[PDB]
Design a protein around this ligand. Structure first.
Ligand code: FAD
Length: 367
């Protein structure tokens, strides 16, 4: 019952870590509270560095074979006029980004994990108790199915409300909510949306981001002040919302507005603002939403989870092969990832807090 790594959470971050460790021959058990099939809303965006991880995992061809989309442009509008146009490929060819539903990528990764004999995935399972040795390393973990494991390393890949973080490391985080919630819905795909990603914001705090997802659908991400968001999402046949959009979303996206046939399918997007001071303690490390929360206006939750996963895999690989002490490996992991995650956490908060003020908002983008 000795294992190398116990991963708490089989979300995109934990799955990626499991596969990368598995590919190297390490003995991994992944504990996931939900069913494997269980499919929810999630982030959709892979940035260049996340794409490089997927390429290194041998998955990049399959991503677009499974309905992932390469893109290289964004338009940003404020009060119905074009504020910025970005071409991410103008100077660098690999500047492109990918839109891929997080759950489709996760499914792809789990398919690959099935093939890795040294990884065992336990769905509808949880950690029940842990014991620490005299050096305060976790040396034994009891699951809720009675299974006892003896892992060298424990990883929290268990998301924004992380059990590992809160219950195994006793870290609490103070969370002050933003005044505008975010919601996401999935609609039919209009030609304007297939053509180009378009983000719209206005002086009264509206936001509407339209982008294609999968083969034949479109995502619409919206934000409004809390009270107004409730009012709009109550005319469930969507006339109120459509009218609201028409105030700040121009004719280029008329068919994308018309695709918003009702509001019942909208789901709230969790919002945090966090970059933890410590990514690890003892033989416990964390990744993704367990250590940082970026405002979802950035779309980068999945991206940074995958980036973390790759860096942690490299660190744990070195430690498990005896090339460096676990404590040095984990320090190196944090040193690499903390400033990258920090930059995006600061950027998201900047965008979300500035979007009513046109040149201020413009100012955040330029950087
Ligand atoms: C409902 C929803 C909608 C979202 N929509 C968007 C969006 O439109 N745009 C966007 O940019 N971002 C969105 N996000 C955020 C984005 O999905 C995350 O930032 C990203 O998936 C974080 O990756 P992760 O791997 O760190 O954690 P998660 O994806 O949170 O994965 C954590 C995993 O750990 C499991 N888990 C949690 N606690 C335990 C436990 N005690 N024991 C065992 N397993 C556990 C979970 O069931 C889950 O599978 C959304 C998130 C949610 C929940």
């Amino acid at each position: 019952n000795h294992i190398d790594v116990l991963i708490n959470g089989c979300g995109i971050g934990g799955a990626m870590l499991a596969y990368l460790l598995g590919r190297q021959g390490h003995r991994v058990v992944v504990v996931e509270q939900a069913r494997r099939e269980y499919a929810r809303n999630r982030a959709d965006l892979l940035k260049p560095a996340g794409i490089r991880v997927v390429e290194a995992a041998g998955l990049l061809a399959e991503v677009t074979r499974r309905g992932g989309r390469v893109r290289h442009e964004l338009e940003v509008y404020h009060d119905g006029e074009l504020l910025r146009y970005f071409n991410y490929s103008s100077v660098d060819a690999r500047g492109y980004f990918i839109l891929m539903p997080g759950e489709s990528l996760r499914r792809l990764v789990l398919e690959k994990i099935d093939g890795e004999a040294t990884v065992e995935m336990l769905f509808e399972t949880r950690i029940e108790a842990v014991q620490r040795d005299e050096r305060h390393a976790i040396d034994q973990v009891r699951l809720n199915d009675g299974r006892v494991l003896r892992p060298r390393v424990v990883v929290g890949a268990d998301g924004i409300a992380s059990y590992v973080r809160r219950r195994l490391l006793d870290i609490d985080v103070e969370r002050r909510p933003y005044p505008s919630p975010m919601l996401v819905g999935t609609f039919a795909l209009a030609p304007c949306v297939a053509e180009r990603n378009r983000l719209y914001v206005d002086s009264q705090g509206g936001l509407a981001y339209f982008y294609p997802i999968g083969f034949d659908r479109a995502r619409l991400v919206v934000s409004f002040p809390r009270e107004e968001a409730r009012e709009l999402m109550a005319d469930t046949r969507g006339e109120s919302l459509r009218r609201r959009l028409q105030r700040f979303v121009g004719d280029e996206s008329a068919e994308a507005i018309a695709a918003v046939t009702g509001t019942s399918r909208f789901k709230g997007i969790p919002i945090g603002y966090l970059n933890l001071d410590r990514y690890w303690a003892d033989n416990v490390a964390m990744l993704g939403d367990a250590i940082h929360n970026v405002h979802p206006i950035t779309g980068q939750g999945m991206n940074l989870a995958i980036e973390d996963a790759s860096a942690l895999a490299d660190a744990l690989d070195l430690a498990l092969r005896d090339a460096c002490a676990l404590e040095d490996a984990l320090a190196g992991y944090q040193a690499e990832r903390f400033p990258v995650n920090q930059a995006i956490v600061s950027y998201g908060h900047a965008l979300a807090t500035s979007l009513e003020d046109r040149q201020r908002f413009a100012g955040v983008f330029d950087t």
